[PDB]
Amino acid sequence: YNVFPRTLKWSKMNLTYRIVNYTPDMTHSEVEKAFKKAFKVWSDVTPLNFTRLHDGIADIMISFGIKEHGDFYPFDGPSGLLAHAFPPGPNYGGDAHFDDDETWTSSSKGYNLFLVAAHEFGHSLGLDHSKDPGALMFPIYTYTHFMLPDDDVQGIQSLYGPGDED
Numbered sequence: 001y002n003v004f005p006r007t008l009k010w011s012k013m014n015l016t017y018r019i020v021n022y023t024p025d026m027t028h029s030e031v032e033k034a035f036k037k038a039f040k041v042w043s044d045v046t047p048l049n050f051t052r053l054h055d056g057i058a059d060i061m062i063s064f065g066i067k068e069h070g071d072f073y074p075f076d077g078p079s080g081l082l083a084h085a086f087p088p089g090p091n092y093g094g095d096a097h098f099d100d101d102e103t104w105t106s107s108s109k110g111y112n113l114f115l116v117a118a119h120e121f122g123h124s125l126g127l128d129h130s131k132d133p134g135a136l137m138f139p140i141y142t143y144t145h146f147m148l149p150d151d152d153v154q155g156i157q158s159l160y161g162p163g164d165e166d
């Protein structure tokens with residue numbers, strides 16, 4: 001017999017993701033780089049492995065959309081809502097949607113795709129928001145070498161463990 005896990009987490013360490021489509025704002029390579037770095041923020045401090053799929057069903061389906069894009073969380077045009085991701089689970093669970101009415105960048109301009117993705121993937125992995133205004137999982141986007149704040153380390157490790165500590 002099995003009771004449901006105490007916290008929403010992935011019950012496997014091996015997770016897949018798929019960049020279903022791409023923003024106009026950045027090259028394919030820039031987007032892939034951003035997401036790759038955003039996943040590594042989490043795999044570096046846990047035992048989580050992330051494999052990119054080019055096609056098929058992945059645990060974390062990543063896409064760029066505007067307004068109504070197939071969930072109960074329609075985007076709202078420029079500014080306001082930026083992105084959202086769903087907590088671990090089947091189907092839309094783990095999926096991350098980015099508002100392509102935002103300007104996504106690999107700089108301090110518009111919204112940094114990597115930074116928002118790293119945050120979003122926190123949600124995909126079971127983290128909600130933090131009260132720590134320094135934390136990656138803080139509810140409000142601000143822009144600053146990236147280092148995962150200790151609050152986010154503690155949160156994610158409470159879910160998945162530290163993985164290899166060295």
Ligand SMILES: COc1cccc(CNC(=O)c2nc3ccccc3c(=O)[nH]2)c1
Pocket residue numbers: 082083115116117119120134135136137138139140141142143144146147148149
């Ligand atoms: C969709 O809402 C979002 C989206 C993304 C981020 C946040 C909140 N965290 C930050 O803004 C942030 N965390 C950091 C953590 C460590 C270093 C720098 C930073 C930094 O420069 N910013 C909310």
Ligand SMILES: [Ca+2]
Pocket residue numbers: 075076077078079080081082099101102
């Ligand atoms: Ca928006």
Ligand SMILES: [Ca+2]
Pocket residue numbers: 058059060061089090091092093094095
């Ligand atoms: Ca999913």
Ligand code: NA
Pocket residue numbers: 023024025099100101102103104
């Ligand atoms: Na855009």
Ligand SMILES: [Zn+2]
Pocket residue numbers: 069070071073074084097
């Ligand atoms: Zn959505």
Ligand SMILES: [Zn+2]
Pocket residue numbers: 119123129137138139
């Ligand atoms: Zn959030």
